[PDB]
Amino acid sequence: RKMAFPSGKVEGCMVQVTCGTTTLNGLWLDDVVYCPRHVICTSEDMLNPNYEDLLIRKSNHNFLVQAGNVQLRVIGHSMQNCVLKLKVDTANPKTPKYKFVRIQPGQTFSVLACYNGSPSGVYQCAMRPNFTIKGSFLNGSCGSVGFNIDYDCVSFCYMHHMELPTGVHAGTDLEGNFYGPFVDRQTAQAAGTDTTITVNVLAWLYAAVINGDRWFLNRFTTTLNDFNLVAMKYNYEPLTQDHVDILGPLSAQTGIAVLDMCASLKELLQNGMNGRTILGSALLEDEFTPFDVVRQC
Amino acid sequence: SGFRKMAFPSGKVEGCMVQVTCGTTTLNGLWLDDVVYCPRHVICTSEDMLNPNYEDLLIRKSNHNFLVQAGNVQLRVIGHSMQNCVLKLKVDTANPKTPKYKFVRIQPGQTFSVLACYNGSPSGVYQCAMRPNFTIKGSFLNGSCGSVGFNIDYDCVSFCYMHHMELPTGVHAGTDLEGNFYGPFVDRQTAQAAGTDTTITVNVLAWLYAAVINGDRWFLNRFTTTLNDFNLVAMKYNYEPLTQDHVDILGPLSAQTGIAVLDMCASLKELLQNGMNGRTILGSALLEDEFTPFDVVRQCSG
């Protein structure tokens, strides 16, 4: 099961930010609200917004920040890359222990999708190798965040900014730097060729075994390099020795050596699933990490 | 592609989770106002789970035998009673985080969010569909009992599931918040069989409406059917028969697309009888049956 972190610690931080006729979500931590800077744009600014120029022309009172019924008074504002930082006269009393991290491609996180400052849904995403995410985001979702939770600490890794014409999504870390080659201007932008997250596919095959499904296993093995030759041919990411090490626990747990499972995946890639399905899916799933699998098996 | 399982935000339910222990048996409970709800098998010794006489075991218990904790903070129990398969422990503190809530009993095919919990602490949240055989495909380990399933409408949490057990096939069974099991199961440590499962027709139809909303409509045919004629055919393909309530909950999608429910039923009947023919719907040759009409509207229209 694709499982998200419990979202309550993040829900207590979501607010609504309005500038002009633009409304999206903000993240309220201590006395700062973080949100996408394109909230200051107009229709006539969207194609080539000179954000430093647009921002100098704004006053604090141009920003309407609402937490529930209460309005939060903006006292200062600044910009860090593509994120606006609105200082408010009130520290959020529900601020969790938190950190800002930049996630690696192949890593997963939970998304709290929000509209008008109100949380609407929670789901798990992976940062794709081409730095998109296959999210579920509609008009007004910008400023929704992605996160992981370790102990009491919320690690924020993603803030939502845009939907590409293909229907995948792009955004920044909480320092305001985009993942991938994208730009917060209102243009049709293509991503690089996506690839499949191989280490995650292998983790999910191990999961399918741990739940007593073995039809895809085989008596064969492969070298790491010969596997990677076939993987690259099918637009799978190369598997590194660190990946092999990371997969150890799953390997021990099943007594299936990593390179044995690589030989199974090689078979699946070349033959196909030939009608069959694995853990319910007609397709190979690549958005479970080895940790995600182990924390649940 | 385009659609995914989305849970409701879990915070309102996190604020209600506690742990309940009797001896060395710990599971989770739900604290609403001044009552804690939990599975009655907390009062069983692991050796009593084989063939428990619950009424007998409960007469032996007193309020001071129940350890209820929010985190590490004990909640004093001042009353106890049993309602079907759940225990209601009256406590001396009303939960200040109690949301607006109701207790609802859902139908097969309906979806809900599960907040999986251990020792009163939430671990994860995910969407489940109640199968026609009254099991769910959860991710539940030892200590998960008393985790709850819910939906959120406006401010109001509708609690619909409390977790009690795992069947030999790996699927899960439980009760509503009044302690009544979904399906033919009993809270005994015996081997119990789930009825053979079937496909959730109303959710497949919702999926076809979702395809149409997104411009994928090759499967719309020129025919209509009666509900009876459809149900008789569907059952030969291990699809559930439709009810009047199913027709009703497809109303909004039917109105959105202008495709009458029975016309879509005729389209589905042709897919069943003739197959997909190497074609795809929403990018798949497989028909999805775990998105309800409500789930579809949320992800299409927001």
XYZ file of N, CA and C in Angstrom, chain B residues 24-203:
540
model
N -0.958 -7.106 29.211
C 0.082 -6.812 28.228
C -0.485 -6.668 26.823
N -1.805 -6.671 26.679
C -2.446 -6.497 25.380
C -2.726 -5.010 25.170
N -2.061 -4.399 24.184
C -2.231 -2.987 23.872
C -2.771 -2.859 22.460
N -3.810 -2.057 22.286
C -4.239 -1.677 20.939
C -4.628 -0.199 20.994
N -5.237 0.284 19.936
C -5.591 1.690 19.845
C -7.061 1.893 20.168
N -7.372 3.102 20.621
C -8.744 3.503 20.820
C -8.965 4.902 20.281
N -10.243 5.251 20.167
C -10.730 6.498 19.592
C -11.414 7.291 20.702
N -10.865 8.461 21.033
C -11.318 9.313 22.151
C -12.158 10.452 21.596
N -13.456 10.416 21.847
C -14.372 11.436 21.370
C -15.211 11.885 22.546
N -15.226 13.186 22.817
C -15.868 13.683 24.026
C -15.283 12.892 25.196
N -16.093 12.346 26.103
C -15.541 11.631 27.252
C -15.670 10.120 27.136
N -15.633 9.585 25.917
C -15.689 8.153 25.711
C -14.527 7.718 24.830
N -13.953 6.560 25.153
C -12.927 5.913 24.342
C -13.512 4.620 23.786
N -13.432 4.468 22.466
C -13.962 3.310 21.745
C -12.815 2.424 21.295
N -12.913 1.109 21.506
C -11.828 0.243 21.073
C -12.365 -1.167 20.888
N -11.594 -2.038 20.232
C -12.035 -3.425 20.046
C -12.123 -4.143 21.370
N -13.196 -4.920 21.528
C -13.374 -5.606 22.803
C -12.324 -6.669 23.041
N -11.582 -7.118 22.019
C -10.637 -8.183 22.340
C -9.415 -7.694 23.099
N -9.357 -6.411 23.462
C -8.315 -5.960 24.360
C -8.395 -6.685 25.700
N -9.572 -7.200 26.064
C -9.717 -7.841 27.379
C -9.293 -9.295 27.353
N -8.899 -9.808 26.185
C -8.498 -11.197 26.017
C -7.015 -11.372 26.263
N -6.679 -12.431 26.995
C -5.328 -12.959 26.956
C -5.102 -13.666 25.626
N -3.852 -13.651 25.150
C -3.564 -14.299 23.872
C -4.070 -15.734 23.855
N -4.150 -16.376 25.021
C -4.742 -17.704 25.089
C -6.267 -17.668 25.121
N -6.867 -16.532 25.466
C -8.319 -16.411 25.428
C -8.847 -16.065 24.047
N -7.981 -15.624 23.134
C -8.442 -15.236 21.807
C -8.952 -16.435 21.014
N -8.602 -17.654 21.423
C -9.021 -18.830 20.668
C -10.543 -18.974 20.658
N -11.169 -18.989 21.837
C -12.623 -19.145 21.954
C -13.105 -18.315 23.138
N -13.192 -16.996 22.966
C -13.460 -16.115 24.107
C -14.939 -16.031 24.440
N -15.244 -16.018 25.735
C -16.588 -15.693 26.207
C -16.539 -14.246 26.679
N -16.854 -13.313 25.774
C -16.605 -11.899 26.046
C -17.392 -11.407 27.255
N -18.684 -11.752 27.326
C -19.485 -11.359 28.481
C -18.871 -11.888 29.774
N -18.363 -13.116 29.747
C -17.702 -13.672 30.923
C -16.448 -12.874 31.259
N -15.603 -12.627 30.258
C -14.368 -11.901 30.504
C -14.640 -10.475 30.979
N -15.777 -9.890 30.593
C -16.019 -8.487 30.926
C -16.557 -8.326 32.338
N -17.335 -9.300 32.811
C -17.797 -9.256 34.192
C -16.617 -9.294 35.149
N -15.520 -9.931 34.759
C -14.367 -9.986 35.639
C -13.643 -8.642 35.725
N -13.789 -7.783 34.724
C -13.027 -6.546 34.639
C -13.692 -5.419 35.417
N -12.857 -4.543 35.957
C -13.295 -3.323 36.603
C -12.682 -2.135 35.870
N -13.177 -0.938 36.184
C -12.608 0.266 35.572
C -11.090 0.319 35.783
N -10.616 -0.069 36.972
C -9.194 0.054 37.283
C -8.318 -0.976 36.575
N -8.882 -1.874 35.766
C -8.106 -2.804 34.954
C -7.725 -2.223 33.584
N -8.244 -1.049 33.221
C -8.045 -0.483 31.892
C -7.075 0.684 31.996
N -5.981 0.611 31.224
C -4.983 1.663 31.149
C -5.215 2.369 29.825
N -5.742 3.575 29.878
C -5.945 4.379 28.681
C -4.936 5.513 28.730
N -4.180 5.710 27.644
C -3.151 6.736 27.604
C -3.235 7.535 26.316
N -3.145 8.861 26.441
C -2.884 9.756 25.320
C -1.406 10.098 25.393
N -0.628 9.551 24.476
C 0.811 9.581 24.670
C 1.164 8.766 25.898
N 1.955 9.357 26.800
C 2.274 8.763 28.091
C 1.348 9.220 29.216
N 0.315 9.999 28.918
C -0.546 10.585 29.941
C -1.755 9.685 30.153
N -1.907 9.160 31.371
C -3.046 8.303 31.680
C -4.344 9.103 31.730
N -5.386 8.523 31.137
C -6.767 8.970 31.220
C -7.539 8.052 32.160
N -8.108 8.602 33.223
C -8.816 7.747 34.177
C -10.141 7.258 33.597
N -10.356 5.940 33.704
C -11.576 5.281 33.260
C -12.554 5.269 34.422
N -13.777 5.728 34.159
C -14.825 5.818 35.168
C -16.072 5.018 34.807
N -16.078 4.328 33.673
C -17.177 3.443 33.343
C -16.744 2.575 32.191
N -17.422 1.438 32.032
C -17.131 0.585 30.884
C -18.387 -0.157 30.482
N -18.549 -0.353 29.176
C -19.615 -1.204 28.670
C -19.208 -1.750 27.316
N -19.947 -2.755 26.878
C -19.684 -3.419 25.618
C -20.884 -3.184 24.727
N -20.613 -2.854 23.473
C -21.642 -2.706 22.452
C -21.176 -3.536 21.272
N -21.860 -4.655 21.015
C -21.410 -5.585 19.994
C -19.927 -5.904 20.178
N -19.059 -5.608 19.209
C -17.666 -5.995 19.333
C -16.747 -4.840 19.761
N -17.307 -3.726 20.250
C -16.477 -2.626 20.734
C -16.777 -2.371 22.198
N -15.733 -1.920 22.873
C -15.749 -1.485 24.254
C -15.855 0.030 24.261
N -16.695 0.545 25.140
C -16.833 1.974 25.375
C -16.355 2.217 26.789
N -15.251 2.936 26.908
C -14.681 3.271 28.194
C -15.008 4.728 28.478
N -15.799 4.974 29.523
C -16.048 6.359 29.895
C -14.835 6.852 30.652
N -14.347 8.040 30.288
C -13.170 8.607 30.923
C -13.544 9.936 31.584
N -12.667 10.415 32.459
C -13.026 11.582 33.245
C -12.671 12.905 32.577
N -12.198 12.891 31.325
C -11.775 14.081 30.599
C -12.402 14.053 29.211
N -13.074 15.128 28.839
C -13.537 15.287 27.473
C -12.377 15.702 26.575
N -12.226 15.023 25.449
C -11.127 15.347 24.544
C -11.284 16.730 23.939
N -10.389 17.679 24.232
C -10.542 19.031 23.684
C -10.368 19.096 22.181
N -9.798 18.064 21.568
C -9.629 18.025 20.120
C -10.746 17.277 19.406
N -11.839 16.942 20.101
C -12.963 16.234 19.489
C -13.471 17.041 18.298
N -13.493 16.482 17.102
C -14.075 17.196 15.967
C -15.593 17.065 15.965
N -16.239 17.831 15.086
C -17.580 17.429 14.684
C -17.492 16.040 14.052
N -18.362 15.135 14.473
C -18.254 13.760 13.990
C -19.606 13.083 13.950
N -19.637 11.977 13.221
C -20.763 11.075 13.200
C -20.192 9.691 12.986
N -21.009 8.692 13.290
C -20.710 7.279 13.077
C -21.588 6.792 11.940
N -20.971 6.331 10.861
C -21.725 5.854 9.705
C -21.307 4.432 9.361
N -22.241 3.682 8.790
C -21.993 2.322 8.320
C -22.019 2.369 6.807
N -20.889 2.048 6.184
C -20.755 2.259 4.751
C -21.202 1.008 4.015
N -21.425 1.178 2.712
C -21.764 0.099 1.805
C -20.530 -0.425 1.089
N -20.570 -1.672 0.623
C -19.486 -2.156 -0.236
C -19.311 -1.248 -1.434
N -18.051 -1.073 -1.818
C -17.664 -0.165 -2.849
C -17.277 1.195 -2.348
N -17.733 1.583 -1.162
C -17.367 2.905 -0.693
C -15.917 2.908 -0.231
N -15.289 4.073 -0.379
C -13.904 4.257 -0.008
C -13.843 5.073 1.271
N -12.704 4.969 1.927
C -12.475 5.686 3.168
C -10.984 5.708 3.437
N -10.574 6.663 4.255
C -9.186 6.770 4.648
C -8.964 5.996 5.933
N -7.846 5.286 5.993
C -7.419 4.571 7.189
C -6.220 5.313 7.756
N -6.256 5.613 9.064
C -5.090 6.135 9.767
C -4.498 4.957 10.542
N -3.461 4.330 9.992
C -2.869 3.173 10.661
C -2.094 3.637 11.890
N -2.374 3.037 13.059
C -1.790 3.486 14.313
C -1.177 2.323 15.084
N -0.156 2.627 15.877
C 0.466 1.643 16.764
C 0.750 2.326 18.092
N 0.357 1.686 19.192
C 0.575 2.248 20.519
C 0.026 3.669 20.618
N -1.128 3.914 19.992
C -1.752 5.212 20.023
C -1.123 6.242 19.114
N -0.047 5.889 18.404
C 0.716 6.822 17.580
C 0.428 6.576 16.110
N 0.022 7.587 15.353
C -0.214 7.372 13.916
C 1.065 7.116 13.142
N 0.999 6.141 12.240
C 2.101 5.777 11.360
C 1.887 6.198 9.913
N 0.675 6.088 9.381
C 0.457 6.333 7.964
C -1.017 6.458 7.651
N -1.311 7.078 6.510
C -2.693 7.263 6.077
C -2.830 6.850 4.611
N -3.890 6.113 4.303
C -4.081 5.609 2.948
C -5.560 5.338 2.708
N -5.943 5.357 1.448
C -7.315 5.096 1.073
C -7.574 3.600 0.898
N -8.726 3.127 1.398
C -9.178 1.750 1.242
C -10.542 1.720 0.580
N -10.831 0.659 -0.153
C -12.173 0.433 -0.672
C -12.760 -0.780 0.036
N -13.982 -0.655 0.534
C -14.679 -1.812 1.079
C -15.079 -2.730 -0.076
N -14.517 -3.935 -0.088
C -14.830 -4.909 -1.138
C -16.250 -5.463 -0.980
N -16.826 -5.993 -2.066
C -18.151 -6.605 -1.962
C -18.209 -7.758 -0.984
N -17.094 -8.416 -0.706
C -17.077 -9.463 0.311
C -16.757 -8.916 1.707
N -16.789 -7.593 1.880
C -16.697 -6.958 3.209
C -15.328 -7.155 3.846
N -14.289 -7.162 3.030
C -12.904 -7.107 3.465
C -12.274 -5.860 2.875
N -11.160 -5.422 3.464
C -10.374 -4.350 2.873
C -8.946 -4.830 2.724
N -8.265 -4.245 1.750
C -6.852 -4.505 1.511
C -6.083 -3.414 2.243
N -5.834 -3.654 3.527
C -5.064 -2.747 4.346
C -3.596 -3.128 4.405
N -2.858 -2.325 5.157
C -1.457 -2.568 5.481
C -1.495 -2.459 6.996
N -1.721 -3.596 7.648
C -1.907 -3.669 9.092
C -0.981 -4.727 9.663
N -0.245 -4.352 10.695
C 0.650 -5.225 11.433
C 0.102 -5.449 12.843
N 0.766 -6.322 13.590
C 0.419 -6.489 14.993
C 0.377 -5.137 15.693
N -0.648 -4.948 16.521
C -0.793 -3.729 17.272
C -1.630 -2.683 16.577
N -2.131 -2.976 15.385
C -2.881 -2.012 14.589
C -4.349 -1.959 14.953
N -4.856 -2.938 15.688
C -6.282 -2.947 15.966
C -6.734 -1.674 16.681
N -7.960 -1.292 16.383
C -8.480 -0.045 16.845
C -8.135 1.148 15.968
N -7.235 0.986 14.990
C -7.102 1.992 13.930
C -8.451 2.174 13.264
N -8.717 3.410 12.794
C -10.043 3.692 12.257
C -9.994 4.164 10.818
N -11.122 3.948 10.159
C -11.372 4.467 8.820
C -12.429 5.543 8.873
N -12.295 6.539 7.986
C -13.134 7.727 8.067
C -13.212 8.417 6.705
N -14.217 9.269 6.586
C -14.338 10.284 5.547
C -14.601 11.624 6.211
N -14.226 12.702 5.535
C -14.417 14.047 6.063
C -15.286 14.805 5.077
N -16.428 15.318 5.561
C -17.343 16.154 4.773
C -17.489 17.514 5.447
N -16.964 18.564 4.816
C -16.961 19.908 5.397
C -16.178 19.804 6.699
N -16.738 20.155 7.845
C -15.960 20.085 9.076
C -16.071 18.726 9.763
N -16.891 17.824 9.235
C -17.408 16.695 9.991
C -16.691 15.406 9.613
N -16.160 14.727 10.610
C -15.541 13.425 10.404
C -16.594 12.336 10.562
N -16.787 11.538 9.507
C -17.659 10.367 9.536
C -16.802 9.121 9.740
N -16.847 8.576 10.934
C -16.091 7.377 11.220
C -16.873 6.172 10.735
N -16.224 5.330 9.951
C -16.932 4.177 9.404
C -16.305 2.815 9.664
N -15.067 2.725 10.145
C -14.391 1.440 10.277
C -13.488 1.446 11.498
N -13.442 0.328 12.206
C -12.453 0.107 13.249
C -11.832 -1.259 13.000
N -10.519 -1.359 13.065
C -9.839 -2.570 12.616
C -9.768 -3.641 13.706
N -10.056 -4.901 13.320
C -10.014 -5.998 14.292
C -9.175 -7.205 13.869
N -9.060 -7.523 12.581
C -8.420 -8.806 12.295
C -7.977 -8.968 10.846
N -7.111 -9.958 10.663
C -6.593 -10.336 9.357
C -7.023 -11.763 9.053
N -7.499 -11.965 7.857
C -7.943 -13.248 7.334
C -6.783 -14.002 6.707
N -6.913 -15.320 6.527
C -5.773 -16.082 5.993
C -5.293 -15.601 4.631
N -6.173 -15.067 3.776
C -5.726 -14.572 2.475
C -4.970 -13.246 2.558
N -4.795 -12.662 3.745
C -4.034 -11.438 3.888
C -4.864 -10.173 3.913
N -6.170 -10.267 3.680
C -7.029 -9.088 3.725
C -7.556 -8.887 5.143
N -8.317 -7.817 5.346
C -8.603 -7.324 6.681
C -10.093 -7.175 6.897
N -10.496 -7.337 8.159
C -11.883 -7.250 8.563
C -12.001 -6.443 9.845
N -13.160 -5.834 10.005
C -13.406 -4.980 11.144
C -14.865 -4.625 11.240
N -15.148 -3.632 12.077
C -16.501 -3.241 12.439
C -16.734 -1.775 12.115
N -17.994 -1.358 12.208
C -18.296 0.063 12.301
C -18.062 0.506 13.746
N -18.372 1.769 14.053
C -18.074 2.314 15.370
C -19.155 1.954 16.385
N -20.207 1.267 15.949
C -21.121 0.611 16.875
C -20.776 -0.851 17.144
N -19.621 -1.347 16.671
C -19.149 -2.684 16.939
C -19.709 -3.786 16.064
N -20.448 -3.453 15.009
C -21.060 -4.465 14.140
C -20.098 -4.775 13.007
N -19.657 -6.028 12.906
C -18.735 -6.399 11.839
C -19.331 -6.094 10.475
N -18.453 -5.709 9.555
C -18.782 -5.740 8.140
C -18.544 -7.174 7.704
N -19.565 -7.804 7.135
C -19.440 -9.153 6.637
C -19.635 -10.218 7.689
N -19.395 -11.486 7.312
C -19.773 -12.605 8.182
C -18.688 -12.986 9.186
N -17.918 -12.023 9.685
C -16.769 -12.357 10.507
C -17.101 -12.156 11.984
N -16.310 -12.819 12.835
C -16.425 -12.807 14.295
C -15.044 -12.546 14.863
N -14.984 -11.811 15.989
C -13.691 -11.515 16.607
C -13.238 -12.694 17.474
N -12.882 -13.793 16.795
C -12.289 -14.972 17.421
C -11.034 -15.347 16.646
N -10.066 -15.933 17.341
C -8.787 -16.269 16.718
C -8.905 -17.614 15.990
N -9.859 -17.664 15.066
C -10.098 -18.823 14.221
C -9.782 -18.483 12.768
N -9.729 -19.530 11.947
C -9.585 -19.372 10.507
C -10.950 -19.101 9.885
N -11.046 -18.010 9.139
C -12.317 -17.545 8.611
C -12.134 -17.176 7.152
N -13.133 -17.504 6.344
C -13.040 -17.382 4.900
C -13.843 -16.184 4.425
N -13.212 -15.354 3.605
C -13.912 -14.306 2.889
C -14.679 -14.896 1.714
N -15.922 -14.450 1.536
C -16.672 -14.786 0.341
C -15.855 -14.478 -0.897
N -16.078 -15.183 -2.002
C -15.322 -14.862 -3.204
C -15.616 -13.426 -3.614
N -14.569 -12.696 -3.954
C -14.773 -11.285 -4.214
C -15.238 -11.086 -5.646
N -15.815 -9.915 -5.867
C -16.367 -9.501 -7.140
C -15.923 -8.072 -7.410
N -16.057 -7.663 -8.674
C -15.694 -6.315 -9.092
C -16.786 -5.308 -8.739
N -16.359 -4.116 -8.294
C -17.303 -3.095 -7.864
C -17.806 -2.298 -9.061
N -18.936 -2.736 -9.595
C -19.493 -2.195 -10.832
C -19.690 -0.684 -10.783
N -20.231 -0.171 -9.677
C -20.569 1.261 -9.651
C -19.319 2.099 -9.773
N -18.213 1.601 -9.234
C -16.940 2.298 -9.322
C -16.313 2.139 -10.702
